[PDB]
């Protein structure tokens, strides 16, 4: 039981999933060819004798990154009809990924998802990995989610999205794609975690002392975060947090489901020996604004609910002391309608370290997951960018020529503004 | 898989195409006999984008070689890497266009374009999933300027959903080689703006400028000029042929680089470009490539980007590179030069990074820029056209082959309209 | 003198020659010889020689001055125009396939004046004239130019009152299967404007089939072909309502509902 | 006892028989010279000491494929008067195979069939293998089944026919021949299994990852289907299905005897290792329209009765769970007059694989045989093609010149329409 | 077992049949001395279809050599593979027909046709199960035209149930050899309407077009022209001689391609046809054979099949092939070119696949096409007949041999009837 199905859409989703699945294989002791020389049933299906296949689907409209998976070290782990390719990529276009190109592949993706979910009996939900800025990872993710919502209904749809930075953005039409995918992931996602690449870059350079990080290190940290999410399903501890407990304790209102991801300790090997990584220290480092995985300031926001996922050599007493010390901090303010906003899970399994990775081996680790009103600032600046690039109607003809119409641009903008308005409505005291 | 059909028109187009196929075969490890002799498996993984499989492990280019002179066909076939091209793809006339746009577009290219279209249809249904076409030609002549434009029209009426790529060598008044360059250039620009998804404006003046002051080449020939253009054409389609950290095909660049459908005239650039003496005194770092590729010296069109505003910029990177360093260099370029970037497009620059660098280079960058300074190249041709056309000069050659003064008037009118569009979006 | 010669029972003689297979019927794709010396044979007793040897001359200046000579003689000599209307439209079909555009624009100006004069004289164009001229006109309606487009649109507009719309619907529908994408797009918007101008009875042979072949172009790789097809569907939708669905996938269909809901 | 006599008519029948008898030789351990180094008596007769001869007849009016058998690997297995050979083929003419050319061979093949039937004391029935589009496989098969019905009577006659495809057709006069052989296989057959070459091409390309399949793979799959039919006689399992039992549980009305074969799992060797091919998965895969052996959509039809024939390591409990899950699944609908429409037989022996074959070795396999109303649409498009070609009286002079009247064409079309009317009449509810 | 009796009439028929017997003897491994020297056992299983058994492991062809000039007999005997033919089968006159259909049919052919009938009867009861006849001749002469016509008439009187095949060379007005082509051609097409089960219309103009455009052969001769026809004739009867996955004899092709008894005039074609320089640039696959066969430039009759409609088309493939690939290719040509196929015949294509490819190739195919563009070949002969017959030119040569004027008018009349029938089914 307690299965979950991982979905990786686009180049960002596939490259995050590569690190995620090497981390899961290292955590469960599975060799890259599938052999194990129990508890792996959350992510793996056992076939025949000595063969574990991941419960994942890799989707991209271009075949390049999927061919990297097919010709890489993990050829034997995945079977080829879990790795689905199109012919032409969505080319940074929401309309191409949603209507023109994604519709010839969505049926086979649904067929493979149905075959993958038929062999599982205790399906907790879906994990969706994609980027808001890309054409495929926005449009096809929106189409897949709005179809999964009616095919499955009340299954939890947790997604991990690469949200574009205020400054660091690799494409021009990313505000269009991000707006037109948030217009659908508002109502087709049970919980959506945003990830900002600029924030991961700053975290890498400051904490890990890496001068020139790349996408690989970013995906390693994201895989560590998702491993901390699902470690309660995969292992056992003093306090266990299922996905339903998680959503109940993190989502106060059905539209308010955009928490912030953090991870601690993020440290290097040579800096590991000097630091006494007590529970209180990494708990404090979770709430420190420069360790946020999204470029936003929690001081100018207010916390609503934060979920604390501990793993390793952790006892509940110094955890309770850590929440006591957090509550007596005056710079970390909570809303008046949530007298206690801490959901704590302690897991016995310490986090594994990937060979060749940048993270040091630590006894304890925290993944603090806060629903806060500070996430609306990134939305505000991306809406400023969208309004600037929409006033002159730049790049609109590409979207109009691929089957989508200008009314969708408009209604996505008022939808996104209404979401912001709901956020300052729930942020204010009474 | 995502095949590209390559077409060469005119002498300049055929020579640049020969150099391009030479450098592509060098990148994919294809010998002049057409057999794979490379070392990496990545060279064969996306071999189909430019090459067709033949019997006995032989790869033939998906190229159509078109001219109205058989001498250029003989020169290409007799040169290096000339034995790989399919002999059925050599489509040639016998007379020549005579630097006449009328003879290329209406008189001789009109009957030869049927055979060209037959060969293009053969290559189009020979491939699995076509995505677009590449035409290399010049605008000063009659074959590439006149017939190549007519050819562009005939593909675009038949394959309209594919990407029309043109590496067009524009004429310049400094290195002005013939007399009727303004007529042919003006009559060719008009059908480029509605029939090409994107157009790369190559200028021989800028190519000579790069070979003089950048490469410090004391005697550049046409081969050294075409090598730069071939490196640029190979740079654009790199993410189609090789894996990378951030992939971007032709349609991705077209989407991110063309905000309005008539603004698709790009000035290209390549980095690094080092002299032999000055090579060992340089650092092979991302900031060095970034500083070089955004310099006005490195542009391959005779336009100063400081005289206009960048609408969009495409940066194609090759080699094992760090994403943070590339992104922070792009951000520093846009922050420090904010007066040269247009303000209603936030983050004008697109980035794409490929893992495989060119041969003999640790890393490389390709600049593709959509600047409003490209109107200067059109204003120079416009004033040169108006000087010739006010006194009705050289018109009896064009009128006697079937043309009229009227379409000269519309050609000047809508090319001035293109100048006005770039001006209104310059602000 | 008059440039024409009225042959008593000449057009019907040509018609009984072509139905009984004594002369070659007008159905081809590329111009050949035997067709044009056929026109030299049955064109001879109708129009005088000094215009004959200049309308079939290799040079285009002689062509344009000959068609100008017919242009001053259009109003004054309308009966000779009516008597051999099939042959002049027949030679109009020949000057379509060449690449010279000056002859194209001069001819289509003369076509404009011709269908004006045939409109005001209440002549009904016959079946063989339509089958010989209209499908050959349906590839002059897909050029990349901007004034020949609008004026051949005016030709096909001002032809509507001298030929029944039901038969011309098929010929403008027949052009929607060639390779030139633009002319599929503009023929679909032409189908749209003929539907809203004459109702539902115009489509042939049955409404259900015609609504089916104007629906496959929604799945076209082109964008303006698809846009014009969707425009035609909402144009027949706004006049007639909800029965267009039964007259008419997984990708095209949803785009059809979203277009008709945003338009409606 | 429990013997069956195979009849192979035409090129398609003879090549399918080649694949079939190769499969039986490997299943019973019989070397291609008749030697083996019991349960073989169903298909093989014992001669003297250690010689096993097949109980089959190979009939063709051309000497090409029969001489391929006579000079092939299995030249010692058959004795030459089981392989009856004509001189001129029927040349895709039903009239030639029925009246002109078939009359000079039918007495000889009936004499051989009579001697073959005198060898066995427990004759279950006849297995007929032919194609519909062929001249011999339609005309001579019609003549032979007429003669078999008048000579034997109540003996069961199961036929395996290669139906023409909607689009993939190799001959022009295929609709004529196919209509004319349906006109007689309505009344002279007891159970007709339809096989469509385009469907086998799709199955091979998708499931087996074969880029370029040929007729050999098609015949291997058909031979596997027939082996799954007759394994209940040949070997013993938990539940055994005789052919009379099969017909009793599958044929609800005497004119309705056209079930639809399918086989699961069809997989490759490299795709075998990643799938835990349980009973439930292959049972669900049988009802998938993509795995049907005829190009038709069962969603547009209604299942009357279906027969499940499991072989291998199969237990009744998860079989019953599989029928339970199929009954709960909405997209498979049964006709209201058949509250239970499942005939189940489990055989102990797993299916054997052939060297050079593309099917992987599996622990379990199943051949589901469904009598559904979705077969009538292939019938409808065949009638459409026949009406198009008969409106202009095309190719009729070839049939008329060989001893045939147009009234036979008319009555064949009328009886074919009557069959379709019967199928749509039993399709509806009450 | 399904033996074929081969007959050769006229100089053109004798030379084409000599090349045909050379290529069949190469296919079955028969040396120029007539003995078997092959390697495979499949070359001897069906040796009897074309060869008789003689004492000493020697195979003699079942061929009949007919001409009215003994010089052609001497040329055939003295050439290569000329010592294998039976000397009793060389039936010759001494005068020659003189390019006269009347002399070849009535006054000079009547004395020789009895000897030819005796020889073909001896070959007819020499074989076990005769299935039909093959006659090779040309329709522009007097011996190919007159003797072959009368021979066909007598054989169909004697053997009405056997399949009559003629590989007839049509006259074309462009490559015109003699003056009296229209008279002989018309008076022969008259009798090939009702007395042949299938007729393969072959034109020397189309063969010269192949040798110039496709083969790039700078100096074709009649040997190079006859090699193509010999390849076709070998390709038609391949499934009779060798095993395959889907066999099709002569009668099966006749059933599948003659929907109405007067429509049995076909357009033969062959694939692949390679140039020596162009052979390395081609990948020998099924789809390129499919596109080469249906190409208009590949046809061996001077008719463009795009002018009309294909009634039925045949495809006899040779070599180890996938049936799925062949079937999807012949589906693709029907779907993509649906305007070129008749609508009331679903699946116009007949498919046959043989396992044994021809020598020097690993896969090949023969195209046979029953198109409505056959009438274009008969329009030319009809108008050329009318031009000569309106002024009664050259009638005194035909009238002096006992022929009346009514034979010409009647033959032109039902030629026009055959043309109108093809036009009727073209719609
Ligand atoms: N963190 C992270 N972000 C990535 C990665 N790969 C791409 N991105 C980001 O994702 C966005 C681009 O989306 P792609 O994933 O490149 O787009 P796609 O989703 O494949 O869509 P198309 O390429 O348009 O078909 C940009 O913001 C990239 O910076 C990766 O490995 N890690
Ligand atoms: N699945 C399959 N179909 C075949 C095979 N051989 C022929 N066919 C199909 O059967 C039909 C042709 O019938 P043949 O069996 O070829 O015909 P015949 O029965 O030998 O008849 P004649 O040759 O006319 O005497 C076509 O649909 C072929 O595709 C085979 O081995 N397997
Ligand atoms: Mg992508
Ligand atoms: Mg030149
Ligand atoms: Mg057969
Ligand atoms: Mg002679």
**Closest in D170, D385, D395 to E351, CB measured:** D170
**Closest in A104, A403, A407 to C262, CB measured:** A407
Residue the block writes with tokens 């199969």: D314
Is A176 within 8 Å of A399 (Cβ atoms)?
yes
Same domain, D211 and D285: no
User: Pick from D309, D301, D286: which is nearest to D235 by CA?
Assistant: D309
Same domain, A252 and A367: no
CB atoms within 10 A of CB B241: 23
Alpha helix stretches (DSSP H) within A153-278: 174-185, 197-207, 215-234, 243-250
Nearest CA in chain B to E333: B125
Same domain, D311 and D186: no
Burial class (CB in 10 A: 0-12, 13-18, 19+), B139: buried
Helix, strand, or coil here: B261? coil
Tokens of C106: 């001069």
Is D113 within 8 Å of D145 (Cβ atoms)?
no
Tokens of C122: 């209440």
Cβ(D63) to ligand 2 under 6 A? Answer: no
CA torsion, ordered A161, A166, A172, A176, to nearest 10 deg: 60
Tokens of D386: 């026949």
Tokens of E419: 């043309």
Is A297 within 8 Å of A200 (Cβ atoms)?
no
User: Pick from D318, D316, D305, D393: which is nearest to D348 by CA?
Assistant: D316
Tokens of B273: 């470009």
Tokens of A199: 């924030």
Suggest the residue from E303, E304, E307 to mutate for an interface test with chain C (most C CBs closer than 10 A): E307
Tokens of C211: 């609504």
Give the CATH number of the domain where residue D277 resides.
3.30.1330.20
**B163 phi and psi angles, rounded to 5 deg:** -90, 120
CA distance A424 to A389: 25
Neighbouring-strand partners of residue B134: B6, B165
Alpha-carbon Rg for chain D in angstroms: 21
HEC profile for chain D?
CCEEEEEEEHHHHHHHHHHHHHHHHHHCCCCCCCCCCCHHHHCEEECCCCCEEECEEEEECCCHHHHHHHCCCCCCCCCCCCEEECCCCCCCCHHHHHHHCCHHHHHHHHHHHHHHHHHCCCEEEEEEEEECCCHHHHHHHHHHHHHHHHHCCCCEEEEEEEECCCCCCCCCCHHHHHHHHHHHHCCCCCEEEEEEHHHHHHHHHHHCCCCCCCHHHHHHHHHHHHHHHHHHHHCCCCCCCCHHHHHHHHCCECCECCCEEEEECCCCHHHHCCCCCCHHHHHHHHCCHHHCCCCCCHHHCCEEEEEEEEEECCCHHHHHHHHHHHHHCCCCCECCCCCCCEEEEEECCCCCCCCCCCCCCCCEEEEEEEEEHHHHHHHHHHHHHHHHHHHCCCCHHHHHCCCCCHHHHHHHHHHHHHHHHHHHHHHCCC
Q: Please enumerate in sequence order all residues whose Cβ is within 8 A of that of A354, keeping only pairs 6 or more positions apart, or say none.
A: A19, A22, A23, A26, A220
Is D192 within 8 Å of D127 (Cβ atoms)?
no
CA distance A419 to A373: 11
Q: Please enumerate in sequence order all residues whose Cβ is within 8 A of that of D202, keeping only pairs 6 or more positions apart, or say none.
A: D290, D295
Is E368 within 8 Å of E293 (Cβ atoms)?
no
Which chain E residues are within 8 Å of D389, Cβ to Cβ? 344-346
> CA neighbours within 13 Å on the CB side: how many for A128?
31
Instruction: Say whether domain B265-376 belongs to CATH 3.20.10.10.
Output: no
Which residues in E15-118 belong to E strands, given as ranges? Answer: 51-54, 58-61, 63-67, 90-92
Give E101 Cα–ligand 6 centroid separation in angstroms: 11
CA distance D105 to D103: 5
Neighbouring-strand partners of residue D156: D125
**Catalytic residue ranges of D:** 245
Nearest CA in chain E to C21: E420
Is B28 within 8 Å of B41 (Cβ atoms)?
no
Give A13 Cα–ligand 3 centroid separation in angstroms: 9
Same domain, A243 and A99: yes
CA distance C5 to D311: 91
CA distance E195 to E188: 11
DSSP string, A51-97: -EEESEEEEESSSHHHHHHHHSTTTTTS-GGGEEE-SS--TT-HHII
CA distance C168 to C161: 11
Tokens of B306: 């400081």
CA distance C91 to D41: 83
Give E246 Cα–ligand 2 centroid separation in angstroms: 7
For chain B, the structural domain boundaries read 3-257, 265-376, 377-426
Nearest CA to ligand 1 atom 27: A133
Which residues in B261-359 belong to E strands, given as ranges? Answer: 265-271, 310-318, 349-354
Same domain, A273 and A242: no
CA distance E240 to E234: 10
Give B395 Cα–ligand 4 centroid separation in angstroms: 20
Same domain, D191 and D296: no
Same domain, A59 and A101: yes
Binding site for Mg(2+): which residues of E?
69
Task: Give all chains having 3 or more CB-to-CB distances under 8 Å with chain A.
Answer: B, C, D
Tokens of C1: 């003198």
CA distance D64 to D10: 11
**Closest in A34, A46, A78 to D276, CB measured:** A46
User: Pick from B117, B357, B367, B416: which is nearest to B228 by CA?
Assistant: B367
Q: Please enumerate in sequence order all residues whose Cβ is within 8 A of that of A146, keeping only pairs 6 or more positions apart, or say none.
A: A184, A188
Q: How remote is the C-alpha of C47 from its chain's centroid?
A: 24
Does the beta carbon of C253 lie under 8 angstroms from any beta carbon of chain A? no
Which residues in B55-184 belong to E strands, given as ranges? Answer: 58-61, 63-67, 90-92, 130-138, 163-170
User: Pick from B58, B120, B50: which is nearest to B89 by CA?
Assistant: B120
Tokens of E197: 């089960």
In chain B, what is the straight-line distance between the N-terminal and C-terminal CA atoms, in Å? Answer: 42
Q: How far apart, in Å, are the Cα atoms of B385 and each of B174, B187, B262, B394, E182?
A: 15, 10, 21, 11, 61
Interface of D with A (CB under 8 A): 209, 271, 273-276, 278, 280-281, 284
Neighbouring-strand partners of residue E169: E138, E202
Task: Give all chains having 3 or more CB-to-CB distances under 8 Å with chain B.
Answer: A, C, E
Indicate which technique resolved this structure: cryo-EM
The last residue of one of the domains, among D374, D394, D416, is: D374
CA distance A78 to A96: 27
CATH T-level assignment (fold) for domain B3-257: Rossmann fold (3.40.50)
The dihedral through the CA atoms of D134, D136, D142, D144 has a sign that is negative
Tokens of E370: 């029953």
For chain E, how many helices (H) and strands (E)? Answer: 16, 12
Is B211 within 8 Å of B225 (Cβ atoms)?
yes
Is E335 within 8 Å of E342 (Cβ atoms)?
no
Q: Looking at CA atoms only, how far is residue B106 from chain C in angstroms?
A: 6
For residue A216, which ligand has an atom nearest its CA?
1
Q: Which secondary-structure segment (H or E) carries A310?
A: strand A303-312
Same domain, D173 and D316: no
DSSP string, A387-406: HHHHHTTTTHHHHHTTT--H
Q: How far apart, in Å, are the Cα atoms of E375 and each of B138, D251, E182, E266, E380?
A: 48, 55, 15, 11, 9
The last residue of one of the domains, among A215, A231, A259, is: A259
Same domain, A190 and A99: yes
Is C93 within 8 Å of C26 (Cβ atoms)?
yes
CA distance C86 to C88: 6
CA distance B15 to B227: 10
Residues with CB under 5 A from ligand 6 (ion): E 11, 143
E279 DSSP assignment = S
Contact assignment for A91 to B254 by CB distance below 8 Å: yes
For residue B92, which ligand has an atom nearest its CA?
4
Contact assignment for C28 to E307 by CB distance below 8 Å: yes
Give the CATH number of the domain where residue A415 resides.
1.10.287.600
**Candidate of A62, A68, A162, A215 to mutate for ligand 1, largest count of ligand atoms within 8 Å of Cβ:** A162
Contacts for E105-111: CB closer than 8 Å, 24+ residues apart:
E105/E145, E105/E146, E105/E147, E105/E149, E105/E150, E105/E187, E106/E146, E106/E401, E106/E402, E106/E403, E107/E401, E107/E402, E108/E68, E108/E146, E109/E68, E109/E143, E109/E146, E109/E147, E109/E150, E110/E150
Contact assignment for E306 to C177 by CB distance below 8 Å: no
Same domain, D235 and D276: no
CATH T-level assignment (fold) for domain B377-426: Helix Hairpins (1.10.287)
Residue the block writes with tokens 């799992």: D265
Helix, strand, or coil here: B61? strand
Which of A68, A198, A245, A408 does the annotation list as catalytic?
A245
Q: Please state whether at least 3 CB pairs lie below 8 Å between chains B and D.
A: no
Burial class (CB in 10 A: 0-12, 13-18, 19+), A217: buried
CA distance D227 to E370: 44
Same domain, D209 and D354: no
- E3-257 against E265-376: fold identical: no
In chain C, what is the straight-line distance between the N-terminal and C-terminal CA atoms, in Å? Answer: 61
Instruction: Mark whether A245 is an active-site residue.
Output: yes
Helix, strand, or coil here: E39? coil
Contact assignment for B158 to C102 by CB distance below 8 Å: no
Peptide bond into D265 cis (omega under 30): yes
Same domain, D26 and D174: yes
Contact assignment for A88 to B131 by CB distance below 8 Å: yes
Q: Looking at CA atoms only, how far is residue D356 from chain A in angstroms?
A: 23
Strand A156-163 vs strand A125-131: parallel, antiparallel, or unpaired? parallel
CA distance A92 to A86: 15
Contact assignment for E131 to D395 by CB distance below 8 Å: no
The last residue of one of the domains, among A219, A240, A259, is: A259
Give the CATH number of the domain where residue D243 resides.
3.40.50.1440
Is B106 within 8 Å of C100 (Cβ atoms)?
yes
Q: How remote is the C-alpha of D422 from its chain's centroid?
A: 23
User: Pick from B266, B253, B371, B328: which is nearest to A172 by CA?
Assistant: B253
Cβ(A12) to ligand 1 under 6 A? Answer: yes
What is the stated resolution of the deposited model, in angstroms? 2.9
Nearest CA in chain A to D364: A48
Nearest CA to ligand 1 atom 17: A134
CA torsion, ordered B410, B411, B413, B417, to nearest 10 deg: 130
Q: Buried (b) or exposed (e) across D224-245, using 16+ Cβ within 10 A? A: bbbbbbbbbbbbebebebebee
User: Pick from A5, A400, A327, A352: which is nearest to A180 by CA?
Assistant: A400
Which chain E residues are within 8 Å of B54, Cβ to Cβ? 280-283
Cβ(A61) to ligand 1 under 6 A? Answer: yes
Length of chain E in terms of residues written = 427
CA angle, E133 then E138 then E142, to 5°: 110
Which chain C residues are within 8 Å of E420, Cβ to Cβ? 21
**Closest in B247, B255, B344 to A62, CB measured:** B247
Suggest the residue from B32, B65, B88 to mutate for an interface test with chain E (most E CBs closer than 10 A): B88
Q: Domain residues for A386?
A: 375-429
**Closest in C60, C144, C221 to B153, CB measured:** C144
**A48 phi and psi angles, rounded to 5 deg:** 65, -115
Residue the block writes with tokens 């116009």: E348
CB atoms within 10 A of CB A108: 12
SS3 content of chain A, % helix, strand, coil (to 5): 45, 15, 35
Strand E51-54 vs strand E58-61: parallel, antiparallel, or unpaired? antiparallel
CA distance B153 to D393: 47
């Amino acid at each position: 039981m307690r299965e979950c199905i991982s979905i990786h859409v686009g180049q960002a989703g596939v490259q995050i999933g590569n690190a995620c699945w090497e981390l899961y294989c290292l955590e469960h002791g599975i060799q890259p060819d599938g052999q194990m020389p129990d508890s792996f049933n959350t992510f793996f299906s056992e076939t025949g004798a000595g063969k574990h296949v991941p419960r994942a689907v890799f989707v991209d409209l271009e075949p390049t990154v999927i061919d990297e998976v097919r010709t890489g070290t993990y050829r034997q782990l995945f079977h080829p009809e879990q790795l689905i390719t199109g012919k032409e990529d969505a080319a940074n276009n929401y309309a191409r990924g949603h209507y023109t190109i994604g519709k010839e592949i969505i049926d086979l993706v649904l067929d493979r998802i149905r075959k993958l979910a038929d062999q599982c009996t205790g399906l907790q939900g879906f994990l969706v990995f994609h980027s808001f800025g890309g054409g495929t990872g926005s449009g096809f993710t929106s189409l897949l989610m709005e179809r999964l919502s009616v095919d499955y209904g009340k299954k939890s749809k947790l997604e991990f999205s690469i949200y574009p930075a205020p400054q660091v953005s690799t494409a021009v039409v990313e505000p269009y794609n991000s707006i037109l995918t948030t217009h659908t992931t508002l109502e087709h996602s049970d919980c959506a975690f945003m990830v900002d690449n600029e924030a991961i870059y700053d975290i890498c350079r400051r904490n890990l002392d890496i001068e020139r990080p790349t996408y690989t290190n970013l995906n390693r940290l994201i895989g560590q975060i998702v491993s901390s999410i699902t470690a309660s399903l995969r292992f056992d501890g003093a306090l266990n947090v299922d996905l339903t407990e998680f959503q109940t304790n993190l989502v106060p209102y059905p539209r308010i489901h955009f928490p912030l991801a953090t991870y601690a300790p993020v440290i290097s090997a040579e800096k590991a020996y000097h630091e006494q990584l007590s529970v209180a220290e990494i708990t404090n480092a979770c709430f420190e604004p420069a360790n946020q995985m999204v470029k936003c300031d929690p001081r100018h926001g207010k916390y609503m609910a934060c979920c604390l996922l501990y793993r390793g050599d952790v006892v509940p007493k110094d955890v309770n002391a850590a929440i006591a010390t957090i509550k007596t901090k005056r710079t970390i303010q909570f809303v008046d309608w949530c007298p206690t906003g801490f959901k704590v899970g302690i897991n016995y399994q310490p986090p594994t370290v990937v060979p060749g990775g940048d993270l040091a081996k630590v006894q304890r680790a925290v993944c603090m997951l806060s629903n806060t009103t500070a996430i609306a600032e990134a939305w505000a600046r991306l809406d400023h960018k969208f309004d600037l690039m929409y006033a002159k109607r730049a790049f609109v003809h590409w979207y109009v020529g691929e089957g989508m119409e200008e009314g969708e641009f408009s209604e996505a903008r008022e939808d996104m503004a209404a979401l912001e308005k709901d956020y300052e409505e729930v942020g204010v005291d009474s | 898989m995502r095949e590209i059909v390559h077409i060469q028109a005119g002498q300049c187009g055929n020579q640049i195409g020969a150099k391009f196929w030479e450098v592509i075969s060098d990148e994919h490890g294809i010998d002049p006999t057409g057999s794979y002799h490379g070392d990496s498996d990545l060279q064969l993984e996306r071999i189909n984008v430019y090459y067709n499989e033949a019997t006995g492990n032989k790869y033939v280019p998906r190229a159509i070689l078109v001219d109205l002179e058989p001498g250029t066909m003989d020169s290409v076939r007799s040169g290096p890497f000339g034995q790989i091209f399919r002999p059925d793809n050599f489509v040639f006339g016998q007379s020549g266009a005579g630097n006449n746009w009328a003879k290329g577009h209406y008189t001789e290219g009109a009957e030869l374009v049927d055979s060209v279209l037959d060969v293009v249809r053969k290559e189009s249904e020979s491939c699995d999933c076509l995505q677009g076409f590449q035409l290399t030609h010049s605008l000063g002549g009659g074959t590439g300027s006149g017939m190549g434009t007519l050819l562009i029209s005939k593909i675009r009426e038949e394959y309209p959903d594919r990407i029309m790529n043109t590496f067009s060598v524009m004429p310049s008044p400094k290195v002005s080689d013939t007399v009727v360059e303004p007529y042919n250039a003006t009559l060719s620009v008009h059908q480029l703006v509605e029939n090409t998804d994107e157009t790369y404006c190559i200028d021989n003046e800028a190519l000579y400028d790069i070979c003089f002051r950048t490469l410090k080449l004391t005697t550049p020939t046409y081969g050294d000029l075409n090598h730069l253009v071939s490196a640029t054409m190979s740079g654009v389609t790199t993410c189609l042929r090789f894996p990378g950290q951030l992939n971007a095909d032709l349609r991705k660049l077209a989407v991110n680089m063309v905000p309005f459908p008539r603004l698709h005239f790009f000035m290209p650039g390549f980095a690094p470009l080092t002299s032999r003496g000055s090579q060992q005194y340089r650092a092979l770092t991302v900031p060095e490539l970034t500083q070089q590729m955004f310099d006005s010296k490195n542009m391959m069109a005779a336009c100063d980007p400081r005289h206009g505003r960048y609408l969009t910029v495409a940066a194609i990177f090759r080699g094992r590179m760090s994403m943070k360093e590339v992104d922070e260099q792009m951000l520093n370029v846009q922050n420090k030069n904010s007066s040269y970037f247009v303000e209603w497009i936030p983050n004008n620059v697109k980035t794409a990074v490929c893992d495989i660098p060119p041969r003999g280079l640790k890393m490389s960058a390709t600049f593709i820029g959509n600047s409003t300074a490209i109107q200067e190249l059109f204003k120079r041709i416009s004033e040169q056209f108006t000087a010739m056309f006010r006194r009705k000069a050289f018109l009896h050659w064009y009128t006697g082959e079937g043309m009229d003064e009227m379409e000269f008037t519309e050609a000047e009118s809508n090319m001035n309209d293109l100048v006005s569009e770039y001006q209104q979006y310059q602000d | 003198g008059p440039i024409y010669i009225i042959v008593p029972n000449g057009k019907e003689q040509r018609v009984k020659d072509e139905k009984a297979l004594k002369v070659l019927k007008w159905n081809f794709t590329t111009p050949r010889d035997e067709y044009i010396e056929q026109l030299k044979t049955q064109m001879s007793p109708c129009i005088a020689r000094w215009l004959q040897d200049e309308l079939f001359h290799a040079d285009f200046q002689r062509q344009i001055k000959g068609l100008a000579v017919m242009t001053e003689h259009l109003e004054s000599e309308k009966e000779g125009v009516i008597s051999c209307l099939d042959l002049v439209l027949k030679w109009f079909t020949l000057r379509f396939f060449d690449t010279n555009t000056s002859v194209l624009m001069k001819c289509l100006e003369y076509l404009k004046l011709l269908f004006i004069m045939l409109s005001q004289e209440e002549y009904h164009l016959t079946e063989m004239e339509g089958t010989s001229f209209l499908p050959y006109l349906m590839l002059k309606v897909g050029e990349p130019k901007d004034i020949v487009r609008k004026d051949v649109r005016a030709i096909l507009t001002k032809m509507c009152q001298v030929y029944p719309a039901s038969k011309m619907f098929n010929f403008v529908m027949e052009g929607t299967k060639s390779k030139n994408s633009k002319q599929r797009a503009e023929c679909l918007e032409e189908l749209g404007c003929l539907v809203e101008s004459y109702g539902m009875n115009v489509c042939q042979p049955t409404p259900a089939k015609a609504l089916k072949e104007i629906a496959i172009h929604i799945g076209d790789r082109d964008t303006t072909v698809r846009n014009a097809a969707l425009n035609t569907i909402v144009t027949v939708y706004n006049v007639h309502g909800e029965q267009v669905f039964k007259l008419i996938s997984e990708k095209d269909m949803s785009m059809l509902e979203e277009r008709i809901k945003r338009a409606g």
